[PDB]
Design a protein around this ligand. Structure first.
Ligand SMILES: CCOC(=O)c1ccc(OCCCCC2CCN(c3ccc(C)nn3)CC2)cc1
Ligand SMILES: *C(=O)CCCCCCCCCCCCC
Ligand SMILES: *C(=O)CCCCCCCCCCCCC
Lengths: 268, 283, 62, 5, 56, 62, 50, 268, 132, 5
């Protein structure tokens, strides 16, 4: 705008929380669909839904990770990453069924003398590969669901040989997007790139995507967030540079059906 | 209103440029692909386009019958000590790789299904006896129904299950199935479990396979030779061809780049290096 | 109940629209053949999923 | 009768 | 069939207060329970039952 | 003598009512296929066979 | 039988129903060919005593 | 109604819960005011409120108590009794401010050969008297707030003489309504009587009452439920009869302001 | 009714007989069909029918049975139970063909201190299993 | 001719 407005400068406000950014590269709405509540024509459980609105549809900041020259990549699953986040998590565990959309805001600032590019991908149904060459589809629920902490990618597939006490976890090789497909094609998924010379952040607005109108949030993750270094971090001449990546996510238009007593999962 | 078989856009003639408009420059960080056509960066002539995307429509891409399984049955002598072999197959597109890979370009799909059955038989022993023409029973057993234990037990009565009686030597059998899913679309990928492990409950009790939803989704096909035992043993195979028709697909995905290892997205050590050596400055 | 449609005619004989006729014999839609009369859509939801509409002649970033 | 197209 | 992916949940009955009888009254009694479907109920994909069979 | 009826269309192609055609070839009705154009009735003769009509919000006994 | 629907005993939302009882109609329930018997016949040599 | 309807037979439905009764004595709406949400004209915190609706405004059943010939009486405070009740409690502890109305349903059935009458009273600001004759206004928060469990009345004031480690609790004498006023006048408070020959229950609908439009639910109780035997339990000839009293309470029109991290109170 | 009428209190009158009850739980009309005479459109024997009316369509009381803690259940077949009942039985045995509907009234009173529940079922074609 | 439905 001649009166100053820009694609790089944004303000997002949800509930009692506001995010500002002065170096954005626009924002992505996945598949062109903004989050919406479940319509009567597509409805399936007949009971009155719980809709927490501002108590849950607000910005939750997960633990900050660290990007270095050794970093192969990071991944998170939704709703899992948010399972312990305030009243969203509480509503999630008290109901059999729940659906939700999300605003994902990835934060990474550095300096005009740093280099590197992070690919931020939102994958519908991000099924990852496990660590075993003797048995298949065998990753434990505990290992499959890291919560807020997330998981990381590896540059090398290294098979769990302990047949007596199997690790039962994922072994996500980075150039294969941890699922057997090549990373260069992951751009067909909703994404943005944090290229440090261009932008401090990535913002992805995600619709609820599923083959059902509503489902078990505790048994099933709808979206996976994968962040991988497309171009490695570099700075001036320092052999070991580091810059933080902070992840802030807001549930959007979430509703819950099937109220009963709280689910207490075996997470270890 | 754009039909699949409509012609693509004409190339418009384009002249020289000395402008502040910059089509060639962009920023992929945004998540968008730059929508450029040749006239944006070079001088072009006028071409009247006649090409069409008719054969790459989702229907057209899948409009072909693919082999999803091979079933083996036989009809032995009465005197043999081994049971007469009837076949049981759990229905899926995942036992073979080709159609599976095409469907996995997408996360979700809806379609009606056409199944065509090719049946071949041969003699097993360097014998000289013969058999009369065989009739085959292909019975669909939906999850819940009694699975056959013997080639001739009561289940083969099929009072409620659909069955095809196929006469050997006739045109291959064919049936259609509607969209039978208990979801609004078939999930080609399910990032979840069918059970919640509960704290209070035994570790063994809350356990289930990753990515697996119903332990029996669609049931099985049970196939047998209806003819009684002949002195000469005959072995037969039933090849099943599946064609997705009236198909719709959602959420595109990258194709499988390394060999499949089982029903899930798992990959096996040693199969992970698909790409060949080629140098950066070599044409 | 016959359905009559146009063929997109490729190689022409030395011989005006050519048609073909279709009749459905079964009550269930699943039994029906594939029409192949399909539609095309714009790739935008994949190629341009950005909140602020892009103009290709303008600076993508501003 | 004939549904044309 | 029993399948965790399509599990329906739990029905349970409890005493809210307690059953109270006077004297000269039986202190034990029975309740009977009935089930039926509401008008929004439907079934599909016809199949054979396991509840009847014919060995030989 | 052709009979033309609507199909209840389930899974749609990316491709308006769809019809199917039926002609009876035989003089005897027994030779005919099953129409499947069937009717539904109210369960009352089984679920509510009581002489005095019940109002669900009211006390069943009074 | 008490003709109740969920809205009589719980708070409900508005759902537009699409399910049908088409496959449980008396025709549909029986619209399948069932095996009712197996008959055995044969054609022997002329010379047999049976 | 000529078509069967009666003041004794009621059905109450809130959320996924329904109460039936065949022996009621009508029901009371306290001060003639049905519960309502806070109006814009009376509003005070400016932030968007959280309104949990069906997730919290439903019937919670507290632990059953036992009425005997020795029973002097029972008391509960609201919202305190409901502090651990599902999503109502969670919403209560995540927000600084909250307001709520209540449907109170007291349950007590017996037999045509039993006798006794329970006075069920709903008291606005039910400040009770403490156990000390040396210090005043000194009942600890822990003792003042029994949660679901409630407290009991006593027929005798017995002063805490341990001056070195004071008990710091209430000593509510029954004929003085535990506060220095005579029980026979407690009928100016919203009430019902469960007289066993007449009714199995009492139902009181309570508006939010306070000198403020909204307040701290954790620091302040708005209503007290007091249940006292106006006429002692009696049966046939049994020297020691017993019948249960079950208390079921539903929050109504509750809204919450001031969202932050959860309050974790020192309750012991 | 505000003027006293109730689903629990009924009076039934057929022929020279009347039944009263003060504790009924409404009454059932099987399959929603009240008994009717055979219509000309559904008729089959061509001869003029005998219709005994009040002489047979009246209340016959069969022998009283006794319910105890050992009681497993009781059964009756119609028209068989009524074969020796006055002019109904006589008309039944003089004619090759006959049709009839029935009002069945089961009677069992006790006291506010008794318990128990009898299921009373009317089964069309109640073929029972034999002892062999 | 065509009895439609
Ligand atoms: C587990 C992974 O695979 C799938 O998700 C997946 C999804 C959809 C697929 O379609 C299978 C649907 C099966 C429905 C069956 C219903 C009827 N069938 C019949 C019917 C009659 C006869 C004689 N033979 N087969 C055979 C197919 C197959 C596989
Ligand atoms: C619309 O279809 C009316 C005209 C019908 C023309 C003849 C159809 C050819 C025979 C079809 C028989 C029906 C298939 C079960
Ligand atoms: C009504 O049916 C008039 C139109 C007839 C159309 C052609 C029918 C196809 C051939 C049927 C032959 C008769 C079957 C014995």
């Amino acid at each position: 705008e001649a009166c100053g407005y820009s694609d790089r400068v944004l303000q997002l406000t949800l509930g009692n929380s506001t995010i500002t950014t002065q170096e954005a590269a626009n924002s992505v709405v996945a598949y062109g669909r903004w989050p919406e509540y479940l319509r009567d024509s597509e409805a399936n459980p007949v009971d009155q839904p719980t809709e927490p609105d501002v108590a849950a549809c607000r910005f939750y900041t997960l633990d900050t990770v660290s990007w270095t020259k050794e970093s192969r990549g990071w991944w998170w699953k939704l709703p899992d990453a948010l399972r312990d986040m305030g009243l969203f998590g509480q509503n999630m565990y008290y109901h059999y069924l729940g659906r939700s959309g999300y605003t994902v805001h990835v934060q990474c600032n550095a300096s005009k003398f740093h280099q590197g590019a992070l690919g931020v991908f939102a994958v519908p149904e991000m099924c990852l590969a496990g660590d075993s060459n003797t048995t298949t589809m065998h990753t434990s629920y505990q290992n499959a669901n890291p919560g807020e902490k997330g998981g990381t990618f590896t540059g090398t597939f290294t098979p769990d040989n302990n047949q007596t006490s199997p690790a039962r976890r994922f072994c996500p090789v980075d150039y294969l997007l941890g699922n057997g497909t090549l990373l260069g094609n992951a751009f067909v998924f909703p994404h943005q790139i944090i290229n440090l010379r261009t932008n401090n952040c990535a913002t992805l607005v995600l619709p609820y995507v599923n083959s059902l109108s509503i489902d078990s949030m505790v048994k099933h993750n709808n979206w996976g967030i994968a962040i991988l270094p497309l171009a490695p971090l570099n700075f001036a001449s320092e052999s070991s540079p580091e810059i933080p990546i902070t992840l802030t996510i807001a549930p959007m238009c979430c509703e819950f059906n099937g109220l009963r007593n709280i689910t207490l999962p075996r997470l270890q | 209103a754009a039909t699949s078989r409509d012609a693509l856009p004409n190339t418009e003639a384009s002249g020289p440029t000395h402008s502040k408009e910059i089509p060639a420059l962009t920023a992929v960080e945004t998540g968008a692909t730059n929508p450029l056509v040749p006239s944006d960066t070079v001088q072009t002539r006028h071409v009247v386009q006649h090409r069409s995307r008719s054969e790459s429509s989702i229907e057209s891409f899948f409009a072909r019958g693919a082999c999803v399984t091979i079933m083996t049955v036989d009809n032995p002598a009465s005197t043999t000590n081994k049971d007469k072999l009837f076949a049981v197959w759990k229905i899926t597109y995942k036992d073979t790789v080709q159609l599976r890979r095409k469907l996995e370009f997408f996360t979700y799909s809806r379609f009606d299904m056409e199944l065509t059955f090719v049946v071949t038989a041969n003699f097993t022993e360097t014998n000289n006896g013969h058999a009369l023409n065989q009739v085959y029973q292909i019975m669909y057993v939906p999850p819940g129904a009694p699975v056959p234990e013997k080639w001739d037990d009561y289940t083969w009565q099929t009072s409620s299950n659909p069955s095809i009686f196929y006469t050997y030597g006739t045109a291959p059998a064919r049936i259609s199935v509607p969209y039978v899913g208990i979801s609004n679309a078939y999930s080609h990928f399910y990032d979840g479990f069918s059970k919640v492990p509960l704290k209070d409950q035994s570790a063994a009790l809350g356990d289930s396979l990753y990515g697996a939803a119903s332990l029996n989704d669609f049931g099985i096909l049970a196939v047998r030779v209806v003819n009684d035992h002949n002195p000469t043993k005959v072995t037969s195979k039933i090849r099943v061809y599946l064609k997705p028709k009236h198909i719709r697909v959602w959420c595109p995905r990258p194709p499988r780049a390394v060999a499949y290892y089982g029903p899930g997205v798992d990959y096996k050590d040693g199969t992970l290096t698909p790409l060949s050596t080629k140098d950066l400055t070599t044409y | 109940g016959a359905q009559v449609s146009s063929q997109k005619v490729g190689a022409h004989e030395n011989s005006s629209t050519i048609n073909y006729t279709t009749i459905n014999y079964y009550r269930d839609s699943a039994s029906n053949a594939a029409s192949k009369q399909d539609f095309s859509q714009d790739p935008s939801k994949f190629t341009e999923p950005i909140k602020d509409v892009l103009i290709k002649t303008a600076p993508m970033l501003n | 009768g004939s549904s044309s197209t | 069939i029993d399948d965790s992916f399509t599990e329906g949940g739990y029905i349970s009955v409890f005493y809210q207060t307690r059953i109270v009888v006077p004297l000269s009254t039986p202190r034990e009694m029975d309740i009977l329970g009935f089930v039926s479907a509401c008008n929004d109920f439907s079934v599909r994909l016809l199949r054979d039952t396991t509840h009847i069979e014919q060995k030989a």
